Design an enzyme around this catalytic site. Structure first.
Site, mmCIF file in Angstrom:
data_model
loop_
_atom_site.group_PDB
_atom_site.id
_atom_site.type_symbol
_atom_site.label_atom_id
_atom_site.label_comp_id
_atom_site.label_asym_id
_atom_site.label_seq_id
_atom_site.Cartn_x
_atom_site.Cartn_y
_atom_site.Cartn_z
ATOM 1 N N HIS A 32 0.816 -1.211 0.000
ATOM 2 C CA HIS A 32 0.000 0.000 0.000
ATOM 3 C C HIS A 32 0.838 1.243 0.000
ATOM 4 O O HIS A 32 1.969 1.249 0.499
ATOM 5 C CB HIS A 32 -0.980 0.010 1.173
ATOM 6 C CG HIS A 32 -0.357 -0.349 2.496
ATOM 7 N ND1 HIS A 32 -0.648 -1.493 3.145
ATOM 8 C CD2 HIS A 32 0.571 0.328 3.286
ATOM 9 C CE1 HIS A 32 0.052 -1.546 4.295
ATOM 10 N NE2 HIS A 32 0.799 -0.431 4.379
ATOM 11 N N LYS A 52 -3.662 1.409 -8.708
ATOM 12 C CA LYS A 52 -3.900 2.124 -7.472
ATOM 13 C C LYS A 52 -5.401 2.125 -7.229
ATOM 14 O O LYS A 52 -6.165 2.447 -8.131
ATOM 15 C CB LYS A 52 -3.360 3.548 -7.594
ATOM 16 C CG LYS A 52 -3.206 4.298 -6.286
ATOM 17 C CD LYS A 52 -2.045 5.280 -6.366
ATOM 18 C CE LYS A 52 -1.821 6.011 -5.045
ATOM 19 N NZ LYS A 52 -0.570 6.828 -5.067
ATOM 20 N N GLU A 99 2.052 2.577 -15.045
ATOM 21 C CA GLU A 99 3.208 1.789 -15.438
ATOM 22 C C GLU A 99 3.644 0.857 -14.293
ATOM 23 O O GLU A 99 3.895 1.324 -13.190
ATOM 24 C CB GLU A 99 4.334 2.752 -15.799
ATOM 25 C CG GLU A 99 5.654 2.111 -16.167
ATOM 26 C CD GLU A 99 6.680 3.120 -16.642
ATOM 27 O OE1 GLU A 99 7.774 2.680 -17.048
ATOM 28 O OE2 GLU A 99 6.434 4.348 -16.581
ATOM 29 N N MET A 101 6.064 -0.996 -12.032
ATOM 30 C CA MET A 101 7.459 -0.789 -11.672
ATOM 31 C C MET A 101 7.921 -2.003 -10.863
ATOM 32 O O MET A 101 7.766 -2.064 -9.646
ATOM 33 C CB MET A 101 7.616 0.552 -10.935
ATOM 34 C CG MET A 101 7.167 1.745 -11.779
ATOM 35 S SD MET A 101 8.227 2.109 -13.192
ATOM 36 C CE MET A 101 9.658 2.788 -12.339
ATOM 37 N N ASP A 151 7.731 16.743 -2.228
ATOM 38 C CA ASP A 151 8.057 15.575 -1.424
ATOM 39 C C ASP A 151 8.974 14.636 -2.188
ATOM 40 O O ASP A 151 8.689 13.448 -2.298
ATOM 41 C CB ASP A 151 6.764 14.869 -0.992
ATOM 42 C CG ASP A 151 6.976 13.798 0.082
ATOM 43 O OD1 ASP A 151 8.023 13.756 0.770
ATOM 44 O OD2 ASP A 151 6.060 12.980 0.230
ATOM 45 N N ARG A 155 11.189 7.051 -0.876
ATOM 46 C CA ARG A 155 9.930 6.291 -0.769
ATOM 47 C C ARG A 155 8.969 6.582 -1.932
ATOM 48 O O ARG A 155 8.083 5.783 -2.226
ATOM 49 C CB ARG A 155 9.240 6.555 0.595
ATOM 50 C CG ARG A 155 8.594 7.931 0.716
ATOM 51 C CD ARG A 155 8.039 8.290 2.096
ATOM 52 N NE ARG A 155 7.933 9.750 2.222
ATOM 53 C CZ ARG A 155 8.908 10.546 2.671
ATOM 54 N NH1 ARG A 155 10.047 10.022 3.097
ATOM 55 N NH2 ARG A 155 8.748 11.870 2.729
ATOM 56 N N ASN A 156 9.145 7.731 -2.580
ATOM 57 C CA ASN A 156 8.257 8.159 -3.661
ATOM 58 C C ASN A 156 8.812 7.897 -5.060
ATOM 59 O O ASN A 156 8.187 8.306 -6.051
ATOM 60 C CB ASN A 156 7.909 9.650 -3.493
ATOM 61 C CG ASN A 156 7.046 9.908 -2.267
ATOM 62 O OD1 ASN A 156 6.235 9.064 -1.883
ATOM 63 N ND2 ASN A 156 7.234 11.063 -1.627
ATOM 64 N N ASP A 172 4.968 8.968 -7.037
ATOM 65 C CA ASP A 172 3.908 9.443 -6.140
ATOM 66 C C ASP A 172 3.900 10.979 -6.174
ATOM 67 O O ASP A 172 4.962 11.605 -6.122
ATOM 68 C CB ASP A 172 4.162 8.960 -4.709
ATOM 69 C CG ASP A 172 3.067 9.367 -3.752
ATOM 70 O OD1 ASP A 172 2.111 8.584 -3.608
ATOM 71 O OD2 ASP A 172 3.150 10.471 -3.165
HETATM 72 C C1 LIG Z 1 4.639 4.525 -4.507
HETATM 73 O O1 LIG Z 1 4.980 3.294 -3.814
HETATM 74 C C2 LIG Z 1 3.918 2.468 -3.538
HETATM 75 O O2 LIG Z 1 2.813 2.660 -4.045
HETATM 76 C C3 LIG Z 1 4.133 1.277 -2.595
HETATM 77 C C4 LIG Z 1 5.580 0.786 -2.746
HETATM 78 C C5 LIG Z 1 5.829 0.092 -4.083
HETATM 79 C C6 LIG Z 1 4.859 -1.078 -4.279
HETATM 80 N N1 LIG Z 1 5.255 -1.765 -5.519
HETATM 81 C C7 LIG Z 1 5.072 -1.378 -6.784
HETATM 82 N N2 LIG Z 1 4.476 -0.245 -7.183
HETATM 83 C C8 LIG Z 1 4.367 0.084 -8.477
HETATM 84 O O3 LIG Z 1 4.738 -0.595 -9.436
HETATM 85 C C9 LIG Z 1 3.811 1.492 -8.731
HETATM 86 C C10 LIG Z 1 3.386 2.306 -7.679
HETATM 87 C C11 LIG Z 1 2.880 3.594 -7.918
HETATM 88 C C12 LIG Z 1 2.844 4.058 -9.233
HETATM 89 C C13 LIG Z 1 3.294 3.246 -10.276
HETATM 90 C C14 LIG Z 1 3.775 1.973 -10.039
HETATM 91 N N3 LIG Z 1 5.623 -2.265 -7.610
HETATM 92 C C15 LIG Z 1 6.162 -3.233 -6.848
HETATM 93 C C16 LIG Z 1 6.859 -4.393 -7.175
HETATM 94 C C17 LIG Z 1 7.303 -5.245 -6.155
HETATM 95 C C18 LIG Z 1 7.078 -4.931 -4.821
HETATM 96 C C19 LIG Z 1 7.597 -5.866 -3.704
HETATM 97 N N4 LIG Z 1 6.750 -7.057 -3.529
HETATM 98 C C20 LIG Z 1 5.385 -6.709 -3.120
HETATM 99 C C21 LIG Z 1 4.528 -7.985 -3.160
HETATM 100 C C22 LIG Z 1 5.106 -9.083 -2.252
HETATM 101 C C23 LIG Z 1 6.624 -9.241 -2.405
HETATM 102 C C24 LIG Z 1 7.334 -7.881 -2.451
HETATM 103 C C25 LIG Z 1 6.396 -3.757 -4.492
HETATM 104 C C26 LIG Z 1 5.934 -2.916 -5.518
HETATM 105 C C27 LIG Z 1 3.438 -0.521 -4.268
HETATM 106 C C28 LIG Z 1 3.153 0.138 -2.921
#
Ligand SMILES: COC(=O)[C@H]1CC[C@@H](n2c(NC(=O)c3ccccc3)nc3ccc(CN4CCCCC4)cc32)CC1
Length: 296
Positions: A32, A52, A99, A101, A151, A155-156, A172
């Site tokens: 989250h 999201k 996208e 990530m 910000d 973390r962002n 973010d």
């Molecule tokens: C802006 O950061 C977030 O929204 C948080 C941190 C990143 C998070 N995240 C995201 N977030 C996105 O891709 C993203 C976030 C905001 C906007 C665009 C893409 N991708 C992740 C890939 C892997 C992992 C690690 N994985 C999670 C599941 C169990 C095992 C460990 C986390 C990923 C989403 C939540």
């Protein structure tokens, strides 16, 4: 029906690309962020996305916040800012499609990919300089388009993948969203004029970028080790600055201290920051410096 303006152009909810809900499938939770959960999803060779979500149990203000977030991200166009594939606002819970990530957030990546005996050369200085350049490039785009992030912090920022060839992007825009329409302010990323007079400019983001650089070269430590928010406020206001991270090359630390000049006029813009990051990147004495090994 709030309007949003960026780069002299005004958009509204009707400009967002609505993707039919039947075309979207959630695969797994990714954790989250500001709003509710972010999910891995696919849109119909399906397109892989981060989704999201807006909690169905939320306020009118939460709704409007989510809408503003969608408008903000949809109007950027830059390789170091996460893309918006579209939205699904006409079904509940509401979605923004972004996208994917696959490398996750930058802070977590740095902490998890620290050099250790099991993974002795997991990262080198050039990996860190590339991340810094990537975010500075996104920041330069925001500055050129007169958008103040407010910000800029690890973390962002997000990574395309965990492996070599990762690209870092700003992911973010929640702080900018709140201001467009306190124990939660990001005090440790703010310059003296921001937390005093509430004055924000692009030189605000310069300061924050200096703190991000520290986060990067420390491999994901919390800024101002052992200091609380009020202690940081008093420290920074009185001229106090962080020490170099462990093993940080001098030229890299000097970028940080220039970003942290007391007067905004004395801080570099992002064109100059990128020039300096490039110089560091080509200097063998910088890039041949070994990062510390965390014992394990
Ligand atoms: C802006 O950061 C977030 O929204 C948080 C941190 C990143 C998070 N995240 C995201 N977030 C996105 O891709 C993203 C976030 C905001 C906007 C665009 C893409 N991708 C992740 C890939 C892997 C992992 C690690 N994985 C999670 C599941 C169990 C095992 C460990 C986390 C990923 C989403 C939540």
């Amino acid at each position: 029906n709030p309007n949003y303006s960026f780069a002299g152009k005004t958009s509204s909810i009707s400009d967002l690309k609505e993707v039919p809900r039947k075309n979207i499938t959630l695969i797994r939770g990714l954790g989250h962020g500001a709003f509710g959960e972010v999910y891995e999803g696919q849109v119909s060779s399906p397109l892989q996305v981060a989704v999201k979500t807006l909690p169905e149990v939320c306020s009118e203000q939460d709704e409007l916040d989510f809408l503003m977030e969608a408008l903000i991200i949809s109007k950027f166009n830059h390789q170091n800012i996460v893309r918006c594939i579209g939205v699904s606002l006409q079904s509940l819970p509401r979605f923004i499609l972004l996208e994917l990530m696959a490398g996750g957030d930058l802070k977590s990546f740095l902490r998890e990919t620290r050099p250790r005996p099991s993974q002795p050369s997991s990262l080198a200085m050039l990996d860190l300089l590339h991340v810094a350049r990537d975010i500075a490039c996104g920041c330069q785009y925001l500055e050129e388009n007169h958008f103040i992030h407010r910000d800029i912090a690890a973390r962002n920022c997000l990574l395309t993948c965990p492996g070599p060839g990762r690209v870092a992007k700003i992911g973010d825009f929640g702080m900018a969203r709140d201001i467009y329409r306190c124990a939660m302010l990001p005090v440790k990323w703010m310059p003296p004029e921001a937390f005093m007079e509430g004055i924000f400019t692009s030189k605000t983001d310069t300061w924050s970028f200096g703190v991000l650089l520290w986060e990067i070269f420390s491999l994901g430590y919390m800024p101002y080790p052992s200091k609380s928010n009020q202690e940081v406020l008093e420290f920074v206001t009185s001229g106090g600055r962080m020490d170099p991270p462990k093993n940080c090359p001098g030229p890299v630390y000097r970028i940080m201290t220039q970003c942290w000049q007391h007067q905004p006029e004395d801080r570099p813009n992002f064109a100059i920051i990128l020039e300096r990051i490039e110089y560091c990147t080509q200097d063998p004495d910088v890039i041949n410096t070994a990062l510390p090994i965390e014992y394990g």
